[PDB]
Amino acid sequence: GCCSDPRCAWEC
DSSP states (O other), rough: OGGGGGGGGOOO
């Protein structure tokens, strides 16, 4: 999932 991108680790 997108948690591996900092720009999607806010609320992932």
